[PDB]
Scaffold this active site. Structure first.
Site, PDB file in Angstrom:
ATOM      1  N   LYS A   1       0.842  -1.183   0.000  1.00 34.36           N
ATOM      2  CA  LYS A   1       0.000   0.000   0.000  1.00 34.36           C
ATOM      3  C   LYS A   1       0.867   1.218   0.000  1.00 34.36           C
ATOM      4  O   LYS A   1       0.814   2.057  -0.881  1.00 34.36           O
ATOM      5  CB  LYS A   1      -0.901  -0.011   1.228  1.00 34.36           C
TER       6      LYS A   1
ATOM      7  N   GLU B   1      -8.406   6.050   6.946  1.00 33.19           N
ATOM      8  CA  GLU B   1      -8.485   6.871   5.704  1.00 33.19           C
ATOM      9  C   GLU B   1      -9.886   7.454   5.545  1.00 33.19           C
ATOM     10  O   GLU B   1     -10.885   6.970   6.178  1.00 33.19           O
ATOM     11  CB  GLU B   1      -8.007   6.141   4.411  1.00 33.19           C
TER      12      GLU B   1
ATOM     13  N   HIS C   1     -18.217  -4.980  -0.564  1.00 35.52           N
ATOM     14  CA  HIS C   1     -16.943  -4.965  -1.289  1.00 35.52           C
ATOM     15  C   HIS C   1     -16.721  -6.148  -2.253  1.00 35.52           C
ATOM     16  O   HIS C   1     -15.644  -6.277  -2.842  1.00 35.52           O
ATOM     17  CB  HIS C   1     -15.753  -4.813  -0.331  1.00 35.52           C
TER      18      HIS C   1
ATOM     19  N   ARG D   1      -2.230  -8.564 -12.394  1.00 38.75           N
ATOM     20  CA  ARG D   1      -2.654  -9.893 -12.751  1.00 38.75           C
ATOM     21  C   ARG D   1      -3.889  -9.767 -13.616  1.00 38.75           C
ATOM     22  O   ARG D   1      -4.475  -8.728 -13.570  1.00 38.75           O
ATOM     23  CB  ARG D   1      -3.088 -10.623 -11.476  1.00 38.75           C
TER      24      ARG D   1
END
Lengths: 430, 426
Positions: free
Chosen positions: B114, B173, B207, B264
């Site tokens: 990250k 965040e 998600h 990927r």
């Protein structure tokens, strides 16, 4: 909003119901009771039972006109077969306030008449097969046969001037065209203009029934392509063609061609062109029937020598063959580069009233090399699980592995000549 | 002729067998015993049972390398999930004389961290989401500087007083609200980079993506061009080889933030394939084997290249028993990628995905695609297990989906509504 009566059944009626839905229109299907488990029944917005019985039930023009009246149809899609080439039926639609999904009846009459379609070809400079134009003077079938110089002739196949009188008796003098490919051109028109979706090759036939259909035609020189398309465009332009039609040719190894048939309708193999070209022919066909232009329907108006699309596709017809049974397991191939058009679901018992087609498998890739396309198609077929009825799936696999198909070294008599070897080879896939 | 070890299972392993085949190359599949009914077993040129069990079996790096050695594999395709982002595994393949189908291990490390990937985005001028090493007095200080807007802790807090209680159950965040998930498909050959435009994966359940669109519906070109140009910067900067995806959150006015670099193949590669008319997996394999973008059939094209006409959407059909009937939809404009066949018993060692259904049309208007998608799913005959098919239908018919008035929190907020609605489709 149109309400389209689908005067047909099976895989085509399903096909049509899907283009109607894509347009936001409504469909009305018809069915005979022995056809009731067909997907075309359930898939329509509304399905109407016919009082007739067999294939006959779908050919009763006045019955279909009653259905259309009673269910407020605006349009009649005849699919292919059945009444798609019947000009009287088209006229009767027109008379009843129904738009027939096809060219004008006068064009149906013309392309349905061997002699008028020939004369049209001849007046435009388009080659036709040497033959007796009408009737048949008949003692002389010998005279034309004598004028073919020892070459064979079709009535049955007559090879010797001696064998004629006896062969003839069994039941119209055409030169037998040998060592040719069957190459056909897809046309479209809006009545003012005409265009094309290039070609298809349907050379691999079993007693004149098409089994494997390719778009493009493999190993076809461009000069022959542009000539074939030009001929087809001249024929279509001369009649101010509206909707879809196919112009069929036999083509010799050196690229001589002969006009053989104008099919003024959708065809079974329209699927391969769709996947090769990335176009929906049946929504285009419906919209053309309803009065839009080629440009409005999304078909480019293009010249005969237009560069063909890259990639390649083939269709194989999966047939029951003959026999009987109820379909117990039916799981067609899928995934990338495969498309399957059918009417069959689990527990259907097909009726012998209708042809042997169970499904059409279309395989498509974006490179150019034929052997790679054949390998892909054989794989997709090997994933087709059918139980309860017999099929041609092994036979299709023997075709696809045959060297002569791999090099496209084929003519329309190739398969009939090699039927015992091919049937032997098919047991490896069985 | 390469022999490609497919270090994966299920629908992606079938996908990769298909691309290997198209190339005239050879596949070696692997499976745990409870996965042996999968299509990916029989579809491979050779299949090998693992001596591991369930999911673990597929994560055993050294075991896979033993399979590759014993079966003279030359290349290893990790699919997605499992060891596809594992840099140590990639290194180990290279060491053993096996080409890993994906970017270099230093890139797997970078895009897997990250803080390094954020840092790269920052150097390049690509926005990243405001955020924070914790300290509760770094978390609360951040929360304050957000002037009252919510914040997320990971790896949801609305009020300062709520913080510490919520805290323990980490970094912080800004919660980005009212955003769409828009991602860019990249491809490279190590010398140059290019793209296949964008996908929209906004419809998510906690998600998890459910519907994935190509193109992103009702996306202004200026926002497209910016998204693609950001992705192309990130990829050119690492001399990327193979396939990769760069994901963003995008506000209604076109502000965007980089959220993730997936180095990927992804699950939703299939919608881009149908929209663009391209085979991403044969490209990916050819790219891993050292051909150029040009050589593999990929146009090298700038950020503002005009997008292909038409539109496509994928729906993920999930088990959410023994599969007694399985008959996926077919016909014009539909593609189904699966591994399932009649009589398979799904293992709860693996995810709930049964089939991907991709629907494609050549016009532009979204409601017609939704209708087509719905009708395809109504033809999906599954008996023996429970699925999300009716739920998927309620999504496709919802007016907000019809207008693409969505965000990444849309489904979760409306779950009871949608669950009610779904009941009409079974």
């Amino acid at each position: 909003t149109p309400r389209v009566l689908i005067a047909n059944r099976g895989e085509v009626a399903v096909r049509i119901e899907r283009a109607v839905s894509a347009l936001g229109w409504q469909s009305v299907a018809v069915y005979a009771p022995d056809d009731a488990g067909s997907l075309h029944v359930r898939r329509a917005d509304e399905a109407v039972a016919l009082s007739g019985r067999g294939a006959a039930a779908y050919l009763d023009g006045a019955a279909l006109l009653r259905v259309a009246q009673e269910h407020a149809a605006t349009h009649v899609h005849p699919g292919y077969g059945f009444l798609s080439e019947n000009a009287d039926f088209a006229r009767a639609c027109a008379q009843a306030g129904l738009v027939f999904v096809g060219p004008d009846p006068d064009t149906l009459d013309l392309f349905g008449d061997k002699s008028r379609a020939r004369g049209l070809a001849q007046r435009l400079g388009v080659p036709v097969i040497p033959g007796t134009d009408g009737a048949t003077t008949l003692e002389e079938a010998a005279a034309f046969m004598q004028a073919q110089g020892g070459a064979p002739v079709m009535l049955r196949v007559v090879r010797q001037a001696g064998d004629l009188a006896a062969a003839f008796e069994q039941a119209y003098a055409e030169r037998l065209i040998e060592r040719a490919r069957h190459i056909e051109v897809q046309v479209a028109g809006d009545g003012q203009s005409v265009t094309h979706l290039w070609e298809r090759d349907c050379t691999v036939q079993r007693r004149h029934q098409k089994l494997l259909e390719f778009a493009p035609a493999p190993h076809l020189p461009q000069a022959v392509r542009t000539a074939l398309i030009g001929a087809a465009l001249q024929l279509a332009q001369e009649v101010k063609y509206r909707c879809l039609g196919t112009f069929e040719f036999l083509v010799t190894p050196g690229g001589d061609f002969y006009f053989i048939e104008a099919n003024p309708r959708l065809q079974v193999e329209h699927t391969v062109t769709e996947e090769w070209c990335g176009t929906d022919l049946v929504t285009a066909q419906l919209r053309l029937a309803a009065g839009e232009t080629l440009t409005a329907v999304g078909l480019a108006t293009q010249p005969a020598d237009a560069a063909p699309p890259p990639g390649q596709a083939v269709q194989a017809r999966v047939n029951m063959e003959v026999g009987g049974g109820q379909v117990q397991t039916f799981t067609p191939p899928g995934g990338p580069g495969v498309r399957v058009d059918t009417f069959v679901t689990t527990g259907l018992t097909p009726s012998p009233q209708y042809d042997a087609l169970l499904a059409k498998v279309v395989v498509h890739r974006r490179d150019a090399a034929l052997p790679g396309l054949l390998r892909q198609a054989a794989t997709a077929l090997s994933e087709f699980q059918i139980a309860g009825v017999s099929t041609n799936l092994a036979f299709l696999q023997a075709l696809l592995h045959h060297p002569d198909v791999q090099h496209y070294e084929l003519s329309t008599h190739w398969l009939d000549e090699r039927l015992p070897e091919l049937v032997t080879q098919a047991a490896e896939y069985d």
